[PDB]
Amino acid sequence: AVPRTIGAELMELVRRNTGLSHELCRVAIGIIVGHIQASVPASSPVMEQVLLSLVEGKDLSMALPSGQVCHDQQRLEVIFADLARRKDDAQQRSWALYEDEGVIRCYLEELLHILTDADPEVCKKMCKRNEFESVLALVAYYQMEHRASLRLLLLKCFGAMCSLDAAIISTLVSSVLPVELARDMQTDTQDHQKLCYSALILAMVFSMGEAVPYAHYEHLGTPFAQFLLNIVEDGLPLDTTEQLPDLCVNLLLALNLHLPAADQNVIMAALSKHANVKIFSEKLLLLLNRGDDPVRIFKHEPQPPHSVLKFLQDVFGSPATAAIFYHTDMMALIDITVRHIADLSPGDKLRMEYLSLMHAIVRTTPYLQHRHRLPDLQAILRRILNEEETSPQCQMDRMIVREMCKEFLVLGEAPS
Amino acid sequence: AVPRTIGAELMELVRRNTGLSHELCRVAIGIIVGHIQASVPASSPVMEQVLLSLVEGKDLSMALPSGQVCHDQQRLEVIFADLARRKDDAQQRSWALYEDEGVIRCYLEELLHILTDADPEVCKKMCKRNEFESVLALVAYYQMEHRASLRLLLLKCFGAMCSLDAAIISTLVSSVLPVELARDMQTDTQDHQKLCYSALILAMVFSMGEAVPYAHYEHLGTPFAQFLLNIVEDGLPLDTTEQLPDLCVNLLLALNLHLPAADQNVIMAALSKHANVKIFSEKLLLLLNRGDDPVRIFKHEPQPPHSVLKFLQDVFGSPATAAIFYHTDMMALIDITVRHIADLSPGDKLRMEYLSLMHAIVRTTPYLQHRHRLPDLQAILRRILNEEETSPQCQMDRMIVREMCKEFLVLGEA
Amino acid sequence: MPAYHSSLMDPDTKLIGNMALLPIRSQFKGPAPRETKDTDIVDEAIYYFKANVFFKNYEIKNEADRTLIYITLYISECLKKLQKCNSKSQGEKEMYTLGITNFPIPGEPGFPLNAIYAKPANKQEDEVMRAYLQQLRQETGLRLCEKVFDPQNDKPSKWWTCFVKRQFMNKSLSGPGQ
């Protein structure tokens, strides 16, 4: 016989010395347990390689070997322990006692490979432990560690930690990390790579869309948003890769994802007070045209509102902010939105968004002056208003379509 | 019973799927097929044959693993073609048109990995495949391509290829690659990152000290040597890492190794031709007391002479060349030599070499004048002469000592 | 086409073997006798060499061409060695050391043109081939020593060394390997 559920032991004992990633480690085993029987069935496998089927199913949180011998766990408990002491070691943190650069660098290079390559469930078990204790430890350490060579690694580590679970992201949002990232970004414009990761990780942090306590806005309010706009509209001599624009545009969308209302929105205020937003006007429509959402870089289950459709619905919340678009883009926007509204099936989740965007456009933008797509949109509203389906999504659709007519009788009347 | 086939196909199949490097693959196999039988007594005699079928190596189990070629060679037989076709793309290489660089890089990045992740037995055979045409293609292509961004990758490839087999070295030395490196290094001194590898590769290929085509001394001759003597003394104003002084010492030792006797030696001309011999003259001492030498990093079969001792034997071949020492550095040389002359175990090759060094020091420069350590010289030579040890080297020692004393009787105390 | 084909095949000359056996003028010894005129098959291969190596195609016009193409390959092998010589004196003795090496005889495997040369059928041709092809090499080397080393400095002369990279229709007398 083969020892029951021994299959987990192969995962550790291979990883200890081959250095495979957790996923590839399983693939290597699956090959080896495959071909052998396919080449020599003549004795062993009939049971004893049908066993190790338990490489399937005997997995995840149930795979944990006896004691604590999991090397991924062992290193993380060692890694976090050394960081904890060294962070509380306020003497060495304030004044130079030891040449701790480079040695801590190797710790971070391990941490940057332990995460992402380990068993995700072991890491998540360790990161959650003691109410995200070590998460705050790293956030405190990054706040106490100013040296850029170390900071660059610390940023990437946060990019790993966000990947594992939504609750971990919720801690980083309510923690102080966003404020420090913003403060550094506004201060330093010479480390291109640090700046790139700063914008990226900050968007990742916000990407889930939960409200910060009303204190982070002392930095992440309008004064920061104006800075981001200039990074898109002219950028920095650093950015020979043309890479900062997309990162900052993504950040602005994500940062809007939790803002309640047309006046409280510090980001919509930022556009209003700007001089002119030529380049940002352009880039945003390219996203709506393809329909994708850049902010959903992670895939956690409670999907937020589609960030761009949300972003536009705020932009048209005020006639002062409506003026930002050049006129030729305004025409293209109506053509883009009227393509989408008539492509989706009924019952599709996004149709109740695009209907709201059109309603805004007709409200605060002088649509009825120029009627760009009107003899088409009237025929569309004709049929969605008559569409005979039962699902709540469609019921919600019909209500806004009715309201869209009864608010402006030019719509829903006959084409002519 | 287990067919031999597992003794290779298992190792091939894991590599193609995982991307594991060959030796790590062989461990990754052994650890699974070992541990399972260690956990499964009842069918272990199956796995124990699987083990042996891989312990014996590729010598016959990997002979036509399934009548097919291993994936690594499937790539090399492609990559060597798609490079050798851009060589003699006579139109494109002189009058460019397409966005070629971004794809050529992908081949060289892949080749650089496979030249070390594959079984060396594969890559050796792909280099010597057809009178080295695979090598001469890349060597020609290095000369042909002026983009600095690619050249680094061709140098890294030559690095691995030099390691595989001394026969490849015997091709490269006899080939154009040294001379282009000699010109690039003198001209493109701004490219510090490439310049470091440029020195390193030139040092690698010369490490075997084979004879070199006489045309090469038109560049790798005395002017290039003086150009090296500058760098080790002055560094570079652009040198952020300051590594090049050390790599230039290695390169000077490497070029010296093949040079015949002490008359015509292009390096010994350079040393005699400047007074700019201070830091270099001292840095040679820190190798001599280290006792090793950095050359022969590959340890291929006919392991070359100890390069440090050969160099000094040439340095003391001429009194103009021997003057390059300050007297205090000269005394350190004597002290370091007697230390080895005292400490070495009898009959090793090096014992004659250090003995030859001291003989040259006594002959080529004033020594019987100031007579530093000379009573200890008498002590060592007397103990060598009277030693009971007999062997080809110890007999050769006994000959040199008598003849050395005959030339300089004060060394024997008459 | 207009590559330089062998001139000397006057039908009055003996024609032993699959190749023109020809009266190699030398102080070495062999089956072939001594030419007395100032022109000879080794001098012909030397004379036409610099032109011949550029022609990428070459017929066998008569039996003497299966000699000449072999002399040309050995001349290339001379340059592949003399280029390394430190002086003319070495260029002579280190050439004799090449002549008495066991070159693949055309019927032996590893010779590059086995399609073009018939097998030597018996000892009284095979041993003649061993005693002829050495007499070619022994002489051919001593003639290049006098004219590859230009007399000012016993450098191997640059103009000759240029041809080291070029091989007659890309065939090599190293065969599949030395």
mmCIF file of N, CA and C in Angstrom, chain A residues 34-83:
data_model
loop_
_atom_site.group_PDB
_atom_site.id
_atom_site.type_symbol
_atom_site.label_atom_id
_atom_site.label_comp_id
_atom_site.label_asym_id
_atom_site.label_seq_id
_atom_site.Cartn_x
_atom_site.Cartn_y
_atom_site.Cartn_z
ATOM 1 N N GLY A 34 2.620 10.207 -14.063
ATOM 2 C CA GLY A 34 1.967 9.790 -15.279
ATOM 3 C C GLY A 34 2.766 8.795 -16.087
ATOM 4 N N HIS A 35 3.912 9.239 -16.601
ATOM 5 C CA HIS A 35 4.620 8.478 -17.622
ATOM 6 C C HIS A 35 5.083 7.120 -17.135
ATOM 7 N N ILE A 36 5.448 7.009 -15.865
ATOM 8 C CA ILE A 36 5.957 5.740 -15.367
ATOM 9 C C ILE A 36 4.943 4.633 -15.609
ATOM 10 N N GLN A 37 3.714 4.815 -15.125
ATOM 11 C CA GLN A 37 2.703 3.788 -15.356
ATOM 12 C C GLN A 37 2.470 3.593 -16.846
ATOM 13 N N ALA A 38 2.532 4.676 -17.612
ATOM 14 C CA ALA A 38 2.339 4.574 -19.044
ATOM 15 C C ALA A 38 3.472 3.825 -19.714
ATOM 16 N N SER A 39 4.580 3.617 -19.014
ATOM 17 C CA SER A 39 5.694 2.873 -19.575
ATOM 18 C C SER A 39 5.952 1.562 -18.862
ATOM 19 N N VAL A 40 5.576 1.456 -17.595
ATOM 20 C CA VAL A 40 5.767 0.207 -16.872
ATOM 21 C C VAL A 40 4.561 -0.042 -15.977
ATOM 22 N N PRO A 41 3.436 -0.449 -16.555
ATOM 23 C CA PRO A 41 2.303 -0.868 -15.731
ATOM 24 C C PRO A 41 2.542 -2.177 -15.017
ATOM 25 N N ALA A 42 3.620 -2.885 -15.341
ATOM 26 C CA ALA A 42 3.680 -4.327 -15.157
ATOM 27 C C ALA A 42 3.674 -4.767 -13.700
ATOM 28 N N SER A 43 3.737 -3.846 -12.740
ATOM 29 C CA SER A 43 3.619 -4.283 -11.354
ATOM 30 C C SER A 43 3.058 -3.210 -10.431
ATOM 31 N N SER A 44 3.842 -2.167 -10.186
ATOM 32 C CA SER A 44 3.503 -1.206 -9.138
ATOM 33 C C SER A 44 2.162 -0.512 -9.341
ATOM 34 N N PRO A 45 1.876 0.123 -10.479
ATOM 35 C CA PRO A 45 0.892 1.215 -10.465
ATOM 36 C C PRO A 45 -0.526 0.762 -10.248
ATOM 37 N N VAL A 46 -0.835 -0.506 -10.529
ATOM 38 C CA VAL A 46 -2.221 -0.971 -10.577
ATOM 39 C C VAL A 46 -3.003 -0.480 -9.373
ATOM 40 N N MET A 47 -2.375 -0.478 -8.206
ATOM 41 C CA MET A 47 -2.825 0.345 -7.093
ATOM 42 C C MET A 47 -1.893 1.504 -6.793
ATOM 43 N N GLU A 48 -0.594 1.256 -6.766
ATOM 44 C CA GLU A 48 0.329 2.120 -6.061
ATOM 45 C C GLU A 48 0.781 3.310 -6.885
ATOM 46 N N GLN A 49 0.178 3.529 -8.046
ATOM 47 C CA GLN A 49 0.228 4.830 -8.681
ATOM 48 C C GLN A 49 -1.135 5.262 -9.168
ATOM 49 N N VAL A 50 -2.168 4.463 -8.928
ATOM 50 C CA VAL A 50 -3.508 5.019 -8.846
ATOM 51 C C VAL A 50 -3.643 5.804 -7.555
ATOM 52 N N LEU A 51 -3.100 5.268 -6.471
ATOM 53 C CA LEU A 51 -2.753 6.103 -5.340
ATOM 54 C C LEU A 51 -1.740 7.151 -5.780
ATOM 55 N N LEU A 52 -1.616 8.199 -4.969
ATOM 56 C CA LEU A 52 -1.171 9.529 -5.360
ATOM 57 C C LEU A 52 -2.166 10.210 -6.274
ATOM 58 N N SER A 53 -3.306 9.585 -6.562
ATOM 59 C CA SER A 53 -4.469 10.384 -6.911
ATOM 60 C C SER A 53 -4.715 11.436 -5.848
ATOM 61 N N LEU A 54 -4.309 11.149 -4.612
ATOM 62 C CA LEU A 54 -4.417 12.077 -3.500
ATOM 63 C C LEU A 54 -3.523 13.291 -3.654
ATOM 64 N N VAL A 55 -2.703 13.359 -4.704
ATOM 65 C CA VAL A 55 -2.139 14.643 -5.077
ATOM 66 C C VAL A 55 -3.249 15.576 -5.530
ATOM 67 N N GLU A 56 -4.363 15.018 -5.987
ATOM 68 C CA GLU A 56 -5.615 15.746 -6.101
ATOM 69 C C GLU A 56 -6.455 15.561 -4.842
ATOM 70 N N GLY A 57 -7.213 16.596 -4.499
ATOM 71 C CA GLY A 57 -8.173 16.518 -3.414
ATOM 72 C C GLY A 57 -7.633 16.608 -1.997
ATOM 73 N N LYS A 58 -6.538 15.907 -1.700
ATOM 74 C CA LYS A 58 -5.882 16.046 -0.401
ATOM 75 C C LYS A 58 -5.029 17.309 -0.332
ATOM 76 N N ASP A 59 -5.629 18.462 -0.617
ATOM 77 C CA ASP A 59 -4.864 19.650 -0.973
ATOM 78 C C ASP A 59 -5.269 20.870 -0.151
ATOM 79 N N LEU A 60 -4.722 22.032 -0.522
ATOM 80 C CA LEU A 60 -4.987 23.323 0.108
ATOM 81 C C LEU A 60 -4.766 23.305 1.615
ATOM 82 N N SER A 61 -5.660 23.958 2.361
ATOM 83 C CA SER A 61 -5.548 24.011 3.817
ATOM 84 C C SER A 61 -5.472 22.632 4.463
ATOM 85 N N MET A 62 -5.971 21.589 3.796
ATOM 86 C CA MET A 62 -5.888 20.235 4.325
ATOM 87 C C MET A 62 -4.546 19.562 4.056
ATOM 88 N N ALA A 63 -3.701 20.141 3.204
ATOM 89 C CA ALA A 63 -2.409 19.553 2.871
ATOM 90 C C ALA A 63 -1.356 19.741 3.956
ATOM 91 N N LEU A 64 -1.621 20.573 4.952
ATOM 92 C CA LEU A 64 -0.618 20.986 5.926
ATOM 93 C C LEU A 64 0.028 19.790 6.621
ATOM 94 N N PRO A 65 1.333 19.594 6.481
ATOM 95 C CA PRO A 65 1.985 18.437 7.099
ATOM 96 C C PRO A 65 2.076 18.573 8.612
ATOM 97 N N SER A 66 2.281 17.429 9.265
ATOM 98 C CA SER A 66 2.310 17.379 10.719
ATOM 99 C C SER A 66 3.412 18.270 11.281
ATOM 100 N N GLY A 67 3.142 18.842 12.450
ATOM 101 C CA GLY A 67 3.989 19.867 13.031
ATOM 102 C C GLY A 67 3.836 21.224 12.377
ATOM 103 N N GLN A 68 4.943 21.780 11.869
ATOM 104 C CA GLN A 68 4.905 23.043 11.138
ATOM 105 C C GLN A 68 5.977 23.088 10.060
ATOM 106 N N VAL A 69 6.321 21.936 9.497
ATOM 107 C CA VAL A 69 7.528 21.771 8.699
ATOM 108 C C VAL A 69 7.399 22.457 7.347
ATOM 109 N N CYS A 70 6.240 23.040 7.065
ATOM 110 C CA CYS A 70 6.065 23.706 5.783
ATOM 111 C C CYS A 70 7.071 24.834 5.651
ATOM 112 N N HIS A 71 7.958 24.716 4.665
ATOM 113 C CA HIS A 71 9.063 25.658 4.556
ATOM 114 C C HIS A 71 8.565 27.063 4.265
ATOM 115 N N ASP A 72 7.487 27.180 3.488
ATOM 116 C CA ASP A 72 6.870 28.481 3.256
ATOM 117 C C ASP A 72 6.431 29.129 4.561
ATOM 118 N N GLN A 73 5.792 28.362 5.441
ATOM 119 C CA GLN A 73 5.441 28.891 6.750
ATOM 120 C C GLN A 73 6.685 29.232 7.556
ATOM 121 N N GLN A 74 7.628 28.293 7.636
ATOM 122 C CA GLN A 74 8.817 28.474 8.462
ATOM 123 C C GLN A 74 9.558 29.755 8.115
ATOM 124 N N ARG A 75 9.771 29.998 6.827
ATOM 125 C CA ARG A 75 10.490 31.198 6.424
ATOM 126 C C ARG A 75 9.707 32.461 6.752
ATOM 127 N N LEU A 76 8.399 32.454 6.506
ATOM 128 C CA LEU A 76 7.604 33.636 6.811
ATOM 129 C C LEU A 76 7.587 33.930 8.304
ATOM 130 N N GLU A 77 7.517 32.896 9.142
ATOM 131 C CA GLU A 77 7.595 33.151 10.574
ATOM 132 C C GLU A 77 8.965 33.696 10.950
ATOM 133 N N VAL A 78 10.022 33.195 10.309
ATOM 134 C CA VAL A 78 11.355 33.749 10.522
ATOM 135 C C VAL A 78 11.450 35.155 9.951
ATOM 136 N N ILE A 79 10.985 35.341 8.716
ATOM 137 C CA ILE A 79 11.118 36.639 8.063
ATOM 138 C C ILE A 79 10.379 37.722 8.839
ATOM 139 N N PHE A 80 9.113 37.478 9.171
ATOM 140 C CA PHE A 80 8.351 38.486 9.897
ATOM 141 C C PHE A 80 8.916 38.740 11.288
ATOM 142 N N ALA A 81 9.426 37.702 11.946
ATOM 143 C CA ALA A 81 10.009 37.886 13.272
ATOM 144 C C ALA A 81 11.196 38.843 13.245
ATOM 145 N N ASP A 82 12.101 38.674 12.280
ATOM 146 C CA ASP A 82 13.244 39.577 12.189
ATOM 147 C C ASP A 82 12.818 41.001 11.868
ATOM 148 N N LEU A 83 11.837 41.168 10.987
ATOM 149 C CA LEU A 83 11.339 42.506 10.699
ATOM 150 C C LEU A 83 10.731 43.152 11.935
#
